[PDB]
Symmetry: C2
Amino acid sequence: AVQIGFLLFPEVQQLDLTGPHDVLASLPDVQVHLIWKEPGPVVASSGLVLQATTSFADCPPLDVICIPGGTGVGALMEDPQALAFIRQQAARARYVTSVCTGSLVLGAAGLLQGKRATTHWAYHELLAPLGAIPVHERVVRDGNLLTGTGITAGIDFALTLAAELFDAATAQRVQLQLEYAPAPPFNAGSPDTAPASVVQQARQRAADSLHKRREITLRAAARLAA
Amino acid sequence: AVQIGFLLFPEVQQLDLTGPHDVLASLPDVQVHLIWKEPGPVVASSGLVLQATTSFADCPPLDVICIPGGTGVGALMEDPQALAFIRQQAARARYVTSVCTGSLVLGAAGLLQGKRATTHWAYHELLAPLGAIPVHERVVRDGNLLTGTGITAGIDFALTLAAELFDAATAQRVQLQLEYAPAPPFNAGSPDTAPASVVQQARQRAADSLHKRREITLRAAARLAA
């Protein structure tokens, strides 16, 4: 069975995780793990309570690891236990993936050094200090690394993974079974397409978080420099 | 605060729920409830464990009710407690919504009689016996009823609801904050666009479930006829 693991941490953006989880869990001969320091409840940033299924110590070697984003990313960027786990799994995984600000965690772990990557538009400036080559595209692949943007990036890239792990027909069948054919009623999902006034409001609301994450990023970069 | 409730039941398709939940929970002055017969763990069809936050008896009057789909829909279609709750909330809700096979539950509750509605493509034949006017469109509105197809229908219609409950700028801001701009790597999300061989495989895999749901639907329709 293909072993797929998601890191589940306090203050995760749950949809970053729950989207690809439901897609990948639809495939034959896959086992999906929700990983944290111990099994038990973990609260997402919305207050939704999820349940981790395995600890770092008990997790099997993964074929796919996926790091979601969320408010809670700041803490993870300085969690040496979590970073060590990610590095250990990444060494042998067939695919190392992230959604949204999850790529900042990969960055803190040292896994973006010299790699093309993306992250959430409001935090994109934080990639370069972590050694990445920043790319403004929705899905960026570099070898076995796949970083994506958007709360539902993992749904889209899960279909890519399905096609490569199995075959295109299998990916198409899952898409059809899920009747997955999005059609957003607005076109404001990028700072390049949203109205300027909306971009300003979003930027202002992110400013405190960005400031705090600048500080964290610099400490994380210092650790990589050592 | 706008009160939004999701029915959370065993064997739910969790993404049907978790998608709109994360979008709507991003809005100011909203409270989101996960409703079942009592608070506590509820297991989704993938094995993901979620937590209901309130009981039927304690739930406040809702402004929006949303019924997700999933394997577990068959049981709900004959759960008199659940159906009575849905009817009670629907009487005063500003919006009555469903995702995927959740519309079959609205049908069993009597809420589709004479109404235009959709459901999952493989189960679409079950709408007419429940009194609906079947429509092959991704989102169907009829008065305050909104039924959608696709595992992520609720993400898209949550943006519509945001715009009507608040304003378009607010919906656009949430879309931008979430960087929501899907781009599926395949085009097989409808039986009209998928390859015929894929449609056949999907139909065959749904056949047992459809057969069982035909039986349930006829019993549910008999109750409506009384």
